[PDB]
């Protein structure tokens, strides 16, 4: 019921810090440059317990199911295996994503009319700003 402000179908609108966060999980040269270019989307969905975030981009396609607390195997659109967690944070989404000892936790919010997500690891953070398709 928290989860419906997110529900529906974000597209990329500003990108602060982002080539310095991909550094910082490990992501190379050429990858980061064409990951730079993309503008991904964001379209999330919820059937019962299960929600559903996919991204779609000229980069790479991902998709996620799950349920708020239960750990999960993702693949991430730069290809790290990770183990993710997404809870609920009052109404802030806090997904981390741990592998080969390392960690970083991405936070989606509403604000106003956009969906602000903001990325940290280690020291690095990087703001991703999504409005409405
Ligand atoms: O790309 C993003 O805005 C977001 C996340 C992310 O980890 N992206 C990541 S992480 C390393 C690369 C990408 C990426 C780059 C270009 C297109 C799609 C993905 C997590 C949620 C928001």
Redesign the pocket.
């Given at each position: 019921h928290m989860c419906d402000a997110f529900v529906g179908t974000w597209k990329?609108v500003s990108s602060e810090n982002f080539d310095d966060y991909?550094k910082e999980?490990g992501?190379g040269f050429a990858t980061r440059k064409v990951?730079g270019m993309?503008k991904?989307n964001?379209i999330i969905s919820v059937n019962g317990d299960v929600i559903t975030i996919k991204?779609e981009?000229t980069?790479?396609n991902t998709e996620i199911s799950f349920i708020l607390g239960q750990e999960f195997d993702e693949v991430?659109?730069?290809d790290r295996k990770v183990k993710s967690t997404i809870t609920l944070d009052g109404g802030v989404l806090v997904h981390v994503q741990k592998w080969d000892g390392k960690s970083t936790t991405?936070k989606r919010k509403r604000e106003d009319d956009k969906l602000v997500?903001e990325?940290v690891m280690k020291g690095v953070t990087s703001t991703?700003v999504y409005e409405r398709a």
């Open positions: 990329l991909m999980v992501v990951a993309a991904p964001m991204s981009s980069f790479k991430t659109a730069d991405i997500v990325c991703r």
